[PDB]
Design a protein around this ligand. Structure first.
Ligand code: HEC
Length: 108
């Protein structure tokens, strides 16, 4: 994928309505169904302290950035086979760009 900054505003709504049930973004935020995402863009997959990852997510060992995050969010199970993230993906590129524009800011 090739990330292009979009609407952080739309991204925030997308996170709230598509991700928040399983993820928090704030520093010190709790793990829920999925791991807290604070600092995700300075980290490899499967490395958030305090979260119980699948071996699949850990072994993928993807150094998260705006580009492979877009690739991942297109189809998480195709990108990380065996992951337990029950999310089909954001198929529209503009949605992924919006979400990641927000996530880059929100997870710092
Ligand atoms: C529950 C129903 C989830 C929804 C909705 C979303 N995610 Fe998720 N995510 C979930 C789990 C259980 C996991 C761990 C998977 C595993 O195999 O252990 C994840 C993982 C991620 C990651 C990787 C985090 C890391 O490696 O530290 C990312 C970057 C991520 N999820 C992002 C994300 C976004 C942006 C979502 C909304 C669009 C989203 N997830 C939905 C559970 C669930």
């Amino acid at each position: 994928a090739e990330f292009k900054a979009g609407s952080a505003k739309k991204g925030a709504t997308l996170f709230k309505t598509r991700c928040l049930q399983c993820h928090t973004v704030e520093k010190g935020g709790p793990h829920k169904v999925g791991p807290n995402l604070h600092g995700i863009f300075g980290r490899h997959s499967g490395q958030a302290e305090g979260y119980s990852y699948t071996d699949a997510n850990i072994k993928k060992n993807v150094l998260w950035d705006e580009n492979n995050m877009s690739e991942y969010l297109t189809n998480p199970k195709k990108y990380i086979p065996g992951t337990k993230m029950a999310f089909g993906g954001l198929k529209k590129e503009k949605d992924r760009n919006d979400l990641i524009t927000y996530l880059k800011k929100a997870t710092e």
